[PDB]
Design a protein around this ligand. Structure first.
Ligand SMILES: [Mg+2]
Ligand SMILES: [Mg+2]
Ligand SMILES: [Mg+2]
Ligand SMILES: [Mg+2]
Ligand SMILES: [Mg+2]
Ligand SMILES: [Mg+2]
Ligand SMILES: [Mg+2]
Ligand SMILES: [Mg+2]
Ligand SMILES: [Mg+2]
Lengths: 51, 117, 150
RNA sequence: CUUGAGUCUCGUAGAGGGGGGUAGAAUUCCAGGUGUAGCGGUGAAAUGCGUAGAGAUCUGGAGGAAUACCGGUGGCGAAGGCGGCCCCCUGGACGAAGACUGACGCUCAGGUGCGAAAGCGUGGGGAGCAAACAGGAUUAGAUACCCUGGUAGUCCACGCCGUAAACGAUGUCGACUUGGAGGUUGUGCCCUUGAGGCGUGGCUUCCGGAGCUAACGCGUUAAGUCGACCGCCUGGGGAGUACGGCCGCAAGGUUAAAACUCAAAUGAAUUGACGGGGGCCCGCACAAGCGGUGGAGCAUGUGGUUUAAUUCGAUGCAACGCGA
């Protein structure tokens, strides 16, 4: 995620990092993998997404 | 001592500690600082404030190089992820580019189990 | 927990009629003996201006201008972690603490008569000296040192 | 004979399988530059790594494993299972204009084959992770959970093992029985002038009617209504144990008792109680303060001890200046 904004106005623009990469992708890989836990615990979200 | 006027600032935003290493656009480190060394330890060195006193401390070590502008290389979560940058710029440093270099493998090595309580 | 009015209104000082002053003459009051207390407050407040040469209030005020804190930590039991999250102290409270500190600190000066004891601390406070200001600094020292959570 | 089943033609989607290449991200390791006193880890720590220069950062190199995003309520497969891209070899499924065969079908004891992970043999490989093991910590103890390391293994080839909550805990085949919302794929019609709308086959989610069910629930993908064939059960423990047979390099698998003993074992649902479950509320419960108790001498009560007797009773909050 590259950010180079012309005209100095010190505005972080942390939207990119917090739009996909950064946390969420790291916290997801922090501990062990998943194996069987993903095919469920993750798909157990659709049981919620439905309603 | 060499006058660079513009290099780059790396930030190791680790869940436990945060260290900032100022170096020219080449990679050659000019100076560094770390929350752990900036005084407080453990329960207190892993806070957002930690990186602040650290980053600002990294400047009082390399600013003696006649630096003017400098890009930012942020990698890793935890605090001091954003805190470090602010203090850096707030120090007069003419910021320019802020890019996240946090490592993100497209599914490679197997992460450690760890933490189980 | 539920109750929420404002504050138990107090009667002004019997000599200058000042709320802040009045309550100060209360913290010093012991065994519900508002009489003796009054004498002490005045037997010292008078001696202060006797030296400072300024009004009892502007003189007393100064004494607080130092002992008066501004930020303190508030323990918040969270997940077995007794955090000391700091926070600024409201105005009405700020003065109270300063008054309570001044007295309690003055009561320990182990001088001769409390009346004069109060005076000394009131003087020393006007320039960061006695134990009054001492505690005051510690308060802010606790905070900021915990600014990480702040 | 053609409607079952199959063949052909042409299309369609797919992580279906076997073989061989290959790409980018990342980890680790090696070498070198910059740079300097910490890094790493946890709740704190400590072990560990650092001035023999780590970490950080940059450059080059080595190697193994897995393929972010796409990605899904998704797709394919008999099941186990199968995700980067490319080629080669190869299986099945579906639709439809039809053309062809002419009951060639369904089920299947024994039999044969396929079987996750772990494990086993031979020879490779070995980055990350990690049984064993070794330290550090926590604890009363901690042969654990946590931290620092780390061997087998995990990866590959070939042979073996044949098990799993191998689960939809639901055998396979076929026919019937209200509906709703959605996904995926084929195909037909529609100014298709459109995103499109309407039909109509395949596979697939959730909801639910009748009916079924002990209840929970299932409900056209049935656990409803029926027909064909097969597998299996006959109270709990003892026991999927013993013995014997067969299989296996072994670990062990498979087939499978009896004695003795119990009057239960069990399924679902119900009320409440409890939760080191969740939500919302109260009370000097906490927080915010004021003054105390705990130390001191004495009063008093209790226990203990003593005594011939120390009359009896009250002992968590609800006994102990309490019946007195
Ligand atoms: Mg371990
Ligand atoms: Mg295996
Ligand atoms: Mg082997
Ligand atoms: Mg299927
Ligand atoms: Mg239903
Ligand atoms: Mg039950
Ligand atoms: Mg009350
Ligand atoms: Mg209290
Ligand atoms: Mg007290």
């Amino acid at each position: 995620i590259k950010v180079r904004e012309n005209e100095p106005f010190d505005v972080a623009l942390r939207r990119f990092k917090r739009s996909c990469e950064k946390a969420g992708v790291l916290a997801e890989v922090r501990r062990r993998e998943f194996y069987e836990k993903p095919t469920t615990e993750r798909k157990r979200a659709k049981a919620s997404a439905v309603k | 001592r060499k006058q660079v006027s513009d290099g780059v600032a790396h930030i190791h935003a680790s869940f436990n500690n945060t260290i900032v290493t100022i170096t020219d656009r080449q990679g050659n480190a000019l100076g560094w600082a770390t929350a752990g060394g900036s005084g407080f330890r453990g329960s207190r060195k892993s806070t957002p404030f930690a990186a602040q006193v650290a980053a600002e401390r990294c400047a009082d070590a390399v600013k003696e190089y006649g630096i003017k502008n400098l890009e930012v290389m942020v990698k890793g979560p935890g605090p001091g992820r954003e805190s470090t940058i602010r203090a850096l710029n707030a120090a007069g440093f003419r910021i320019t580019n802020i890019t996240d270099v946090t490592p993100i493998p497209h599914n490679g090595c197997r992460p450690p189990k760890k933490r189980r309580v | 927990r539920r109750r929420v009015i404002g504050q138990r209104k107090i009667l002004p000082d019997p000599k200058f009629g000042s709320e802040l002053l009045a309550k100060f003459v209360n913290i010093l009051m012991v065994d519900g003996k508002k009489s003796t207390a009054e004498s002490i407050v005045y037997s010292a407040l008078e001696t202060l201006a006797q030296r400072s040469g300024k009004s009892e209030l502007e003189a007393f005020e100064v004494a607080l201008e130092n002992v008066r804190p501004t930020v303190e930590v508030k323990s918040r039991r969270v997940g077995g972690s007794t955090y000391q999250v700091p926070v600024e102290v409201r105005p009405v409270r700020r003065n109270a603490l300063a008054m309570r500190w001044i007295v309690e600190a003055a009561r320990k000066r182990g001088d001769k008569s409390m009346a004069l004891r109060l005076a000394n601390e009131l003087s020393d406070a006007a320039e960061n000296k006695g134990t009054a200001v001492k505690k005051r600094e510690d308060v802010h020292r606790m905070a900021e040192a915990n600014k990480a959570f702040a």
